[PDB]
RNA sequence: AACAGCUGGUUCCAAUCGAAACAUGUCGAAGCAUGACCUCCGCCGAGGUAGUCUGUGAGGUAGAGCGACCGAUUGGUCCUGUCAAACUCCAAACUUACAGACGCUGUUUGACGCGGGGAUUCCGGUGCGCGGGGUAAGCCUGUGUACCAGGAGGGGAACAACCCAGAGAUAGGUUAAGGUCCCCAAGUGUGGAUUAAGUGUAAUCCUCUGAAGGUG
RNA sequence: UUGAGGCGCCCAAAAUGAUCGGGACUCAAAUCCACCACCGAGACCUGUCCGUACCACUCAUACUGGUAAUCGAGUAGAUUG
RNA sequence: AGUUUGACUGGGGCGGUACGCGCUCGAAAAGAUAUCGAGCGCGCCCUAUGGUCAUCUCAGCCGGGGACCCGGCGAAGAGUGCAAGAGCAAAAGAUGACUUGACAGUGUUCUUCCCAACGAGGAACGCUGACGCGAAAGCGUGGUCUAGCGAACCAAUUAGCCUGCUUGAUGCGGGCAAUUGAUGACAGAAAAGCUACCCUAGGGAUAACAGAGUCGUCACUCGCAAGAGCACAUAUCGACCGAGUGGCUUGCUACCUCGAUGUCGGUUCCCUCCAUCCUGCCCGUGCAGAAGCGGGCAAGGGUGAGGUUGUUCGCCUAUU
RNA sequence: UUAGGCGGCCACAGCGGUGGGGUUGCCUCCCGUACCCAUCCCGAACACGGAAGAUAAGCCCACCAGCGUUCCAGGGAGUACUGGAGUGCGCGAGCCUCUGGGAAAUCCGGUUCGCCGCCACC
């Protein structure tokens, strides 16, 4: 920009959105990469390999896809996460992918985060992931519970759009009934 | 196609240099050999350009000297239109300078040393110190220049 | 020389220009070669790890097998074969 | 330079990472009864004496660490590798 | 010293003040000379000296040529005439000598000089028509005080 | 019959190949050892690469430039004056790794390579190109190359390395460098111009000087 | 009046006897631009022979025939009759 | 009494260390490359100044309330232990926390030593074991990279085992693996000088002297002509700078001679050079004359005697 | 790709600027702290939960060249430099001819306000 010596960073790292430094640590594994993206309203699953152009993506899974299955809840939370972690495992699982490392980019390795639901989902529909289980919430937060408690505190429903009063941790096991199922179409 | 004449001795020249008139197959001076103009042979000659005379001979002026210049791979033989005829894929001397000429074969795949080995020029060449355009008779020819040296060794 | 260290002579050799300058694209130090490719050597002066004696710059070895994930390619030095252990950070598919 | 009296590091005997007392090596003392000892009586007589004339050598400017580390469990010591240090002092 | 000693370049150019302690001073005190205030173009002539012969000009051999042609001018022209010159080299060549006999040899710090290729102008001058011949007989007196055999090159005039 | 790394000497013919005057270590620099390089023998069995072209790579010297870093370096009320072995926004020629192609070469002349015997050698020199030191040197110390050393014969008045030229014997012929007034083989050659100083009749050079400046 | 080029002149002093090798040379026997014909090596071409290497025949490294444009200099030194 | 008292080196000595290492340049754009070549460093320091993880972005400038707080610009000029060059920005830097991988064993490869053999040392990259941190990929075989280093014999030290002469017990020894202790002349001897009383082997491989090359120095000249010379550059004197000639001084170099080319000064006797002191012939003058000053041609002839000092040189005297 | 995710090349992509675009769609800003998690102090950030509002930011789409960058034509320039050769020139430092290569600054006019790969998606 200011003149022929001047260095400007990779787009990549321009647009901050990829971290080189954590991205070659994982390419190391010589495994294909779970990425856990989020958006405000919605998460994403991709399982993508090493390519001569730039990645590819062999699998993925969006939460907006997940109510092709019969989900009529919000797609930013954790049952939400879980679920479309387990899709694309399970998507993955078909393609003939049999384990990962999981790329949460940007995002923060708190414990119990969605990133890591997305991790426990892929790996429950039998992806071989390296994973820390004290690291991810315990089931019932999975399941949808803190939000359920939470509309408990009522007075006010907590979700505008009628999916229900007091919500349905009970429509999580369902869905997930539903995709450990062998039939499902993928 | 060129004619190659080295005009200049061994000694002193640099080694590269002579290695390269060795894979040109000449090893004395006076001595002449037929070269095709491709990229490859073209950088041989350039690197050589100052210790030889070349350019493009004319179809008689080859005809004369294949006649009294060219040999068997092997042997005293003279190379007339009867030896051509029944050694080469050619009926006489000129069929075989043509075909030279025109790149379609080489001394060798007609059982013909690659070498021709001249006489000293007749009255003189016009000087090893200098290139053709200083006066002297080293580097390229004009095909009427060629001629007049290659006649001159006959 | 005044010195006889590896990186005697290296100034130029050894250093980016300018708008190379700072950390390398990751796709070059995963890249995977097979036994019997032509590979160049380079070192990337961005990258630390995996070095070559300097004196190699320039050489196009053949991989011959790897040890760990650097790779083990061969040359010949002037009138000698050597192997040389290198990881692909400092590598390039030769044509 | 400083460095802990203990802490935890490879056990060789143990074959188990354990918590060392780490001690600079005393000299043990001689007992005048080995070989060299009889050689030195032996070949010593009339006029010099060969290697037995000669005097100790000089002084390196700093001598290389000289340790033994204790495994604080099994009891045995091990030796390492000295690194040249002016000074060497222990931490409690 | 004779410049019999530094007049050629048969040594590496050896400027580098970072690594070069000593260095005596020029001797050149003035590179603008006349009337600076004004500029080149205010005026229709213009004389530069011409260096024939690549050369290094030792700082007291500048001085001395400038000297004695500035000084030419302001006897023609006044302290204060129409006119302005300039010495566009610098001095930035240092010179040594050894002054052990070839043991240790590096030389001591001795001077400096200004390396001038052939074809190039050492000296400019700019003058009105009428101080035309003046300029020209000051540069006269320049060139017998450096080394190389000049030409006095009229640029900017043609009235002749 | 002391020992010496020091000086001198070491006796017949011929045929094939044919160096090193350098690198590492050394109480080592007037010496050795180990390599390089020379040579001899056995083994292996199909490729090899002194030249060029092209492709895929390596490189910051020449040059250049610095409102591209850096550090030097002018002046005026943006402009205006300069530089760099230990500066670089640029950037050759060129050198170099690998591969293919052509060339050359090898498969009875066995190449490339491997193993073993025997060395000599580790005072070098010169020309040219590029250097670094030095006022310089028939100086010192590098580097690439060809030569002398260890290279005849022809030329250069003579003359290790400048020119031609690399050479079995003998014989005929034609040229090379160089030369053709005589000494001295070949022209007192041809067309044209300049010079009046015997300028000059002197490629190169310790060797052949001739400068700044000046010349109706 | 002024610019450019060619050749020459001044600048130009050393020790036993001056020199371009010498003689000597001036529309040259100098210099520059061209050009013509010649002389001149052991190089190059050519006849015969010798050595060495290789090939064919052979017990032969004895003869005989063949190939070498791509063999023929050499100090120290290695190898062989 | 026996010995030692090193090497390098524009001869040797004195000085210095280019005697082991690292960086830039020299180095001629691959690699390699010398000099008593230019600039300059290393013989450590650090338990964190090592390792990982989390969080984070630095110099410098500006604006608002050279300490602190807020905002903006800001690819890197900060910082990163120490030379130099290089590397590094969601880090290799900063802060915080945790941790001891600065771990044991054993290799591959490169380097040391381009090519091309050679040890110690070093580095990169592995495996086995045991660990640290991290969600995990992963990182950690010390400090971002290139300096910070040492053989055999002997001793001490670490853990287990082998072994000592017919045999058993005890003592005390011998050994396999490794750590530490130094040789810096740094691929490792334990080590001061004089010789003119000297001696031998050799060297012109190397100095003194003469020659030779060079010419900085020295001698002489030329170009330009500031300046002064009451005015006047050029009667005369003449700075600066610039260009040369000589080979008389001095210095440099190490070509020639070390199985020998006799030293300085003087003397005697011969030849020569000219950059001329006199003499001849001239030009200028700040040339009235006389006596001078300066310059030109010119080497035929002349240029002498004495006092001090070995002196050359030079000082001094009377003649000329 | 009517706004997305992961990238390769890593300024042709930077700097700066103009215009356009979103009712249950996408990305966002946005709203909000019971929880998982969080600030050496702050739900600012990180993390979690969520749609009342908005296209003003970001982002995506279209475009501008003033600065920086890439490439191309002409000029500079076959200049500077240079591998091979020369009984060519120069007192000399050095230069020239033949042969094979061949810049840089800079001027001028164009180019460049990213290209491409995988996946997902009115
Ligand atoms: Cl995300
Ligand atoms: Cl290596
Ligand atoms: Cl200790
Ligand atoms: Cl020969
Ligand atoms: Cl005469
Ligand atoms: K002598
Ligand atoms: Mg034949
Ligand atoms: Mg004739
Ligand atoms: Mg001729
Ligand atoms: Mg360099
Ligand atoms: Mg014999
Ligand atoms: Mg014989
Ligand atoms: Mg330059
Ligand atoms: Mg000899
Ligand atoms: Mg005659
Ligand atoms: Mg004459
Ligand atoms: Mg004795
Ligand atoms: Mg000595
Ligand atoms: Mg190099
Ligand atoms: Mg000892
Ligand atoms: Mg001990
Ligand atoms: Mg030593
Ligand atoms: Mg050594
Ligand atoms: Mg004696
Ligand atoms: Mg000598
Ligand atoms: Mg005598
Ligand atoms: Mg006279
Ligand atoms: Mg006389
Ligand atoms: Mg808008
Ligand atoms: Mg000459
Ligand atoms: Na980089
Ligand atoms: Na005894
Ligand atoms: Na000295
Ligand atoms: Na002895
Ligand atoms: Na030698
Ligand atoms: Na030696
Ligand atoms: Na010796
Ligand atoms: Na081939
Ligand atoms: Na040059
Ligand atoms: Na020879
Ligand atoms: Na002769
Ligand atoms: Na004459
Ligand atoms: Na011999
Ligand atoms: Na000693
Ligand atoms: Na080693
Ligand atoms: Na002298
Ligand atoms: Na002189
Ligand atoms: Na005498
Ligand atoms: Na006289
Ligand atoms: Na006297
Ligand atoms: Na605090
Ligand atoms: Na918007
Ligand atoms: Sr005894
Ligand atoms: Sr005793
Ligand atoms: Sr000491
Ligand atoms: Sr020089
Ligand atoms: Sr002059
Ligand atoms: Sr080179
Ligand atoms: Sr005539
Ligand atoms: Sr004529
Ligand atoms: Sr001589
Ligand atoms: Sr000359
Ligand atoms: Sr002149
Ligand atoms: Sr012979
Ligand atoms: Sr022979
Ligand atoms: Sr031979
Ligand atoms: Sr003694
Ligand atoms: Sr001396
Ligand atoms: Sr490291
Ligand atoms: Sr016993
Ligand atoms: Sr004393
Ligand atoms: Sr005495
Ligand atoms: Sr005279
Ligand atoms: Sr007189
Ligand atoms: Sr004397
Ligand atoms: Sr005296
Ligand atoms: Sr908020
Ligand atoms: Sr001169
Ligand atoms: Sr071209």
Not at chain 2, 99 to 126: C, F, I, K, M
Not at chain 3, 1 to 19: A, C, D, F, H, W
Not at chain 3, 47 to 68: A, L, M, S
Not at chain 5, 97 to 126: C, P, S
Request: net charge negative; proline share 5%.
């Amino acid at each position: 920009a200011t003149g022929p010596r001047y260095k400007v960073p990779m787009r990549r790292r321009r647009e901050a959105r990829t971290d080189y430094h954590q991205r070659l640590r994982l390419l190391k594994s010589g495994k294909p990469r779970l990425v856990a993206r989020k958006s405000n309203k919605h998460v994403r699953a991709q399982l993508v390999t090493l390519g001569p152009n730039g990645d590819d993506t062999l699998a993925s899974a969006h939460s907006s896809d997940l109510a092709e299955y019969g989900w009529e809840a919000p797609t930013g939370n954790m049952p939400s996460a879980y679920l479309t972690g387990l899709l694309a495992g399970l998507r993955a699982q078909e393609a003939g992918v049999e384990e990962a490392v999981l790329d949460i980019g940007l995002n923060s390795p708190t414990p119990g985060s969605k990133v890591f639901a997305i991790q426990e989902g892929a790996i429950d529909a039998g992806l071989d992931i390296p994973h820390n289980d004290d690291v991810l919430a315990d089931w019932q937060r999975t399941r949808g519970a803190h939000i359920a408690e939470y509309d408990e505190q009522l007075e006010e429903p907590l979700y505008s759009g009628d999916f229900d009063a007091a919500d349905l941790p009970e429509h999580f096991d369902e869905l997930r009934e539903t995709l450990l199922d062998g039939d499902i179409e993928l | 196609m060129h004619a190659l004449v080295q005009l200049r001795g061994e000694v002193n020249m640099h080694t590269d240099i002579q290695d390269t008139l060795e894979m040109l197959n000449i090893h004395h001076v006076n001595h002449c050999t037929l070269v095709p103009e491709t990229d490859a042979y073209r950088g041989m000659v350039a690197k050589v350009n100052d210790f030889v005379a070349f350019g493009e001979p004319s179809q008689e002026t080859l005809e004369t000297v294949l006649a009294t210049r060219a040999e068997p791979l092997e042997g005293d033989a003279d190379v007339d239109d009867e030896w051509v005829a029944e050694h080469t894929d050619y009926d006489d001397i000129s069929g075989l300078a043509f075909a030279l000429l025109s790149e379609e074969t080489t001394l060798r795949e007609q059982g013909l040393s690659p070498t021709l080995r001249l006489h000293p020029p007749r009255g003189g060449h016009d000087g090893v110190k200098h290139p053709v355009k200083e006066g002297g008779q080293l580097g390229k020819h004009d095909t009427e220049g060629i001629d007049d040296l290659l006649e001159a060794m006959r | 020389p005044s010195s006889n260290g590896p990186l005697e002579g290296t100034r130029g050799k050894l250093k980016n220009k300018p708008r190379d300058r700072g950390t390398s694209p990751p796709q070059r130090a995963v890249e995977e070669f097979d036994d019997g490719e032509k590979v160049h050597l380079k070192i990337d002066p961005s990258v630390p790890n995996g070095r070559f004696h300097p004196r190699f710059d320039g050489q196009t070895g053949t991989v011959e097998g790897k040890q760990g994930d650097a790779y083990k390619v061969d040359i010949v030095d002037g009138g000698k074969e050597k192997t040389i252990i290198v990881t692909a950070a400092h590598l390039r598919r030769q044509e | 330079m400083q460095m802990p009296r203990r802490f935890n590091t490879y056990c060789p005997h143990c074959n188990e990472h354990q918590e060392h007392e780490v001690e600079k090596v005393r000299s043990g003392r001689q007992t005048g009864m080995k070989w060299i000892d009889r050689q030195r009586e032996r070949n010593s007589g009339i006029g010099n004496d060969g290697k037995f004339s000669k005097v100790p050598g000089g002084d390196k400017p700093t001598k290389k660490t000289d340790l033994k580390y204790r495994c604080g469990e099994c009891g045995k010591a091990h030796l390492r590798e000295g690194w040249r240090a002016g000074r060497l002092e222990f931490q409690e | 010293k004779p410049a019999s000693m530094y007049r050629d370049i048969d040594k590496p150019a050896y400027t580098r003040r970072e690594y070069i302690t000593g260095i005596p001073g020029s001797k050149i005190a003035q590179h603008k000379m006349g009337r600076k205030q004004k500029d080149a173009d205010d005026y229709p002539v213009q004389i530069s000296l011409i260096v024939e012969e690549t050369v290094q000009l030792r700082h007291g051999s500048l001085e001395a040529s400038r000297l004695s042609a500035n000084r030419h001018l302001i006897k023609e022209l006044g302290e204060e005439g129409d006119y302005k010159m300039t010495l566009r080299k610098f001095p930035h060549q240092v010179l040594r000598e050894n002054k052990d006999g070839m043991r240790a040899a590096f030389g001591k710090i001795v001077g400096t000089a200004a390396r001038v290729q052939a074809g190039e102008q050492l000296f400019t001058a700019y003058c009105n028509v009428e101080d035309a011949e003046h300029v020209k007989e000051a540069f006269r007196r320049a060139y017998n005080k450096i080394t190389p055999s000049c030409r006095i090159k009229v640029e900017r005039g043609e009235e002749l």
